[PDB]
Amino acid sequence: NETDVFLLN
Amino acid sequence: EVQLQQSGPELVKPGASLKISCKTSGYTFTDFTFHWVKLSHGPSLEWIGTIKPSNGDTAYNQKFKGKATLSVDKSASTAHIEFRSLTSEDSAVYFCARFGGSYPYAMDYWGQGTSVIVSSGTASDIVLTQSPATLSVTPGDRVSLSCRASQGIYNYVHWFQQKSHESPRLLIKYASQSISGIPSRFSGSGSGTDFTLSINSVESEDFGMYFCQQTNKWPLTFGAGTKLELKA
């Protein structure tokens, strides 16, 4: 889940 | 009413630099990440990169790192993309999109696209395999479109419809989640590596291109598309 910090938070 | 409005058509000399814009209205500009997508023949879609408008942080597809720079003007609620050393290979339609809506977010609102003409004068990326590449059907047929990922991506798959001369439109997000205003005939299923978009009864207005997209790993990637067309 490497994109969650940027895209979702 | 949320809207992304892009700057007009451009025509430039090879070697030129060009800055194109995407101005927002109807919501708070700093809420959601902005994405730029290149449309080339097929039609084919490529993800260029993204910018977080609240702090200016960026992530690029390596292919476009030496070519494009993303920026935002918070005071003007406008996102920008600047190209350098433009060549014939850069002639394309460029779209801006926001990655928002109800949680979990997806590319829900798109700009109308900007045609860019560069005038001739006077390895570890997730691969998405879409099949069948062409579906020739009669309205009223029931169809299923497949998207197979090169590795497990959980439920991080989104589906888009792209009709001739129009922007991509989000149909399903996170493999199976429905989108407001999208007709009930569209549904999605799958997890891991096999994903399916189903159209319960194909309507005349459904003919066009269908793309799947993964957002589990950088760079974000698209499948090559499935063309849904009227049987001759």
Residue numbers in the entry:
A (entry chain D): 532 to 540
B (entry chain A): 1 to 122, 139 to 248
Passage from the reporting paper:
Its structure features a central immunoglobulin (Ig)-like β-sandwich that contributes to the binding site for the cellular receptor CD81.
In view of the similarity of the individual complex structures (two complexes per asymmetric unit [AU] in the scFv complexes and one complex per AU in the Fab complex), we selected for further analysis those with the lowest mean temperature factor (B-factor) comprising residues 532 to 540 (indicating the highest degree of order). Since the interactions of the two peptides with the paratope are almost identical, we will discuss the common molecular binding determinants and highlight differences only where necessary. The peptide interaction with the paratope buries an area of ~730 Å2 on the peptide and ~650 Å2 on the antibody, with a total buried surface area of 1,379 Å2 and a shape complementarity index of 0.801 and 0.774 for the J4 and JFH-1 peptides, respectively, similar to other antibody-antigen complexes. Unexpectedly, the peptide forms one α-helical turn comprising residues 535 to 539 (DVM/FLL), in stark contrast to the extended conformation observed in the cE2 structure. The α-helical turn of the peptide with residues M/F537, L538, and L539 establishes mainly hydrophobic side chain interactions, predominantly with the heavy chain, forming a second contact region at the C terminus of the peptide. Both side chain oxygen atoms of D535 form hydrogen bonds with the hydroxyl group of YL32, highlighting D535 as an essential contact residue for DAO5 binding, whereas in the E2 structure it forms hydrogen bonds to the side chains of T534 and T526 and also to the main chain NH group of N532 and G530, thereby dominating the main chain conformation in this particular region.
